[PDB]
Amino acid sequence: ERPTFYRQELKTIWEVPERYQNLSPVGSGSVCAAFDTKTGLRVAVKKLSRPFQSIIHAKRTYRELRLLKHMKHENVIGLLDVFTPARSLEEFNDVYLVTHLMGADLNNQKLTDDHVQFLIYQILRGLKYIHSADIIHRDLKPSNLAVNEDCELKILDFRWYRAPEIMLNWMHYNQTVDIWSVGCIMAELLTGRTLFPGTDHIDQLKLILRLVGTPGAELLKKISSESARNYIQSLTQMPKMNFANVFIGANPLAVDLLEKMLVLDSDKRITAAQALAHAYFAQYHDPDDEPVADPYDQSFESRDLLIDEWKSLTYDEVISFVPP
């Protein structure tokens, strides 16, 4: 059946099932932290802002709901509930999404090696899943990575951490753009400092190239633009520096993994599935507890529909929702 809803203000009117109590705002969609009386869980309740204002809003609402419904993995945030106070598609105007309320993010002495292993392991386990659905995160960074008390980690809400192929204007994009971001995060966890703290995208690329080397002829054979090639080969030619000398006293397997992640050529960068099997994660690696996702149908992405059709498609997904 339909739950009983109650309304309150705090500055839109929120109308939510009565199982969610003690709503207290935590950002502006806009999000309230709440107590889920059914489960005794702390939850985030996000009320989408203007979800069907235009074709672009409606499709983004649909894309967000579809993605969250698909994600079913310990290290990836999924959907705990989705509701609307509307009793039919005609009154359907508001969408609310409920997810685990996570404490800290990774913006956060420094960490021990065992604890860096554990956190990166979790990130890679989550990424293996996401990537197996043919999803690329694209913007992994310490603030999209949430942790509870026991520092169990979940990947959230999908330029110091972005792959250089993106900051150059190359478009040979692997899912390993996310593996670059993990490499930068791991380095920051290991040393306490941002690995590539660029002021603009140019400054950033300079710092990157200083560490990894200027592109080799083999990667240069992959650049289709004359100016682009001209640009890279115009830059002062930097040798690959030694990673050990940047990561002093780091566990040497950490350094070895880093050298595999922080590779300029994306086709040569270690993948998530491969990183998990690397000796650095020995103590956590379980190849039978690193599950993959069902295939994820993003064909909708290329479709040009009407607001009312994206809306109805969204309503179909709300109705058909089943809790974990």
Swiss-Prot record:
<feature type="active site" description="Proton acceptor">
    <location>
        <position position="157"/>
    </location>
</feature>
<dbReference type="GO" id="GO:0000077">
    <property type="term" value="P:DNA damage checkpoint signaling"/>
</dbReference>
<comment type="similarity">
    <text>Belongs to the protein kinase superfamily. CMGC Ser/Thr protein kinase family. MAP kinase subfamily.</text>
</comment>
<feature type="binding site">
    <location>
        <position position="46"/>
    </location>
    <ligand>
        <name>ATP</name>
    </ligand>
</feature>
<dbReference type="GO" id="GO:0006357">
    <property type="term" value="P:regulation of transcription by RNA polymerase II"/>
</dbReference>
<dbReference type="GO" id="GO:0098586">
    <property type="term" value="P:cellular response to virus"/>
</dbReference>
<dbReference type="GO" id="GO:0019903">
    <property type="term" value="F:protein phosphatase binding"/>
</dbReference>
<feature type="domain" description="Protein kinase">
    <location>
        <begin position="20"/>
        <end position="281"/>
    </location>
</feature>
<dbReference type="GO" id="GO:0005576">
    <property type="term" value="C:extracellular region"/>
</dbReference>
<keyword id="KW-0805">Transcription regulation</keyword>
<comment type="function">
    <text>(Microbial infection) Activated by phosphorylation by M.tuberculosis EsxA in T-cells leading to inhibition of IFN-gamma production; phosphorylation is apparent within 15 minutes and is inhibited by kinase-specific inhibitors SB203580 and siRNA.</text>
</comment>
<dbReference type="GO" id="GO:0032495">
    <property type="term" value="P:response to muramyl dipeptide"/>
</dbReference>
<keyword id="KW-0963">Cytoplasm</keyword>
<dbReference type="GO" id="GO:0071222">
    <property type="term" value="P:cellular response to lipopolysaccharide"/>
</dbReference>
<dbReference type="GO" id="GO:1900015">
    <property type="term" value="P:regulation of cytokine production involved in inflammatory response"/>
</dbReference>
<dbReference type="GO" id="GO:0090398">
    <property type="term" value="P:cellular senescence"/>
</dbReference>
<dbReference type="GO" id="GO:2000379">
    <property type="term" value="P:positive regulation of reactive oxygen species metabolic process"/>
</dbReference>
<dbReference type="GO" id="GO:0106310">
    <property type="term" value="F:protein serine kinase activity"/>
</dbReference>
<dbReference type="GO" id="GO:0042307">
    <property type="term" value="P:positive regulation of protein import into nucleus"/>
</dbReference>
<keyword id="KW-0547">Nucleotide-binding</keyword>
<dbReference type="GO" id="GO:0030316">
    <property type="term" value="P:osteoclast differentiation"/>
</dbReference>
<keyword id="KW-0007">Acetylation</keyword>
<keyword id="KW-0804">Transcription</keyword>
<dbReference type="GO" id="GO:0006935">
    <property type="term" value="P:chemotaxis"/>
</dbReference>
<keyword id="KW-0808">Transferase</keyword>
<dbReference type="GO" id="GO:0006915">
    <property type="term" value="P:apoptotic process"/>
</dbReference>
<dbReference type="GO" id="GO:0060348">
    <property type="term" value="P:bone development"/>
</dbReference>
<keyword id="KW-0053">Apoptosis</keyword>
<dbReference type="GO" id="GO:0051525">
    <property type="term" value="F:NFAT protein binding"/>
</dbReference>
<dbReference type="Pfam" id="PF00069">
    <property type="entry name" value="Pkinase"/>
</dbReference>
<dbReference type="GO" id="GO:0045944">
    <property type="term" value="P:positive regulation of transcription by RNA polymerase II"/>
</dbReference>
<dbReference type="GO" id="GO:0004707">
    <property type="term" value="F:MAP kinase activity"/>
</dbReference>
<dbReference type="GO" id="GO:0032868">
    <property type="term" value="P:response to insulin"/>
</dbReference>
<dbReference type="GO" id="GO:0001525">
    <property type="term" value="P:angiogenesis"/>
</dbReference>
<dbReference type="GO" id="GO:0031281">
    <property type="term" value="P:positive regulation of cyclase activity"/>
</dbReference>
<feature type="modified residue" description="N6-acetyllysine">
    <location>
        <position position="141"/>
    </location>
</feature>
<dbReference type="GO" id="GO:0090090">
    <property type="term" value="P:negative regulation of canonical Wnt signaling pathway"/>
</dbReference>
<dbReference type="GO" id="GO:0042770">
    <property type="term" value="P:signal transduction in response to DNA damage"/>
</dbReference>
<dbReference type="GO" id="GO:0005524">
    <property type="term" value="F:ATP binding"/>
</dbReference>
<dbReference type="GO" id="GO:0035924">
    <property type="term" value="P:cellular response to vascular endothelial growth factor stimulus"/>
</dbReference>
<dbReference type="GO" id="GO:0031663">
    <property type="term" value="P:lipopolysaccharide-mediated signaling pathway"/>
</dbReference>
<dbReference type="GO" id="GO:0001649">
    <property type="term" value="P:osteoblast differentiation"/>
</dbReference>
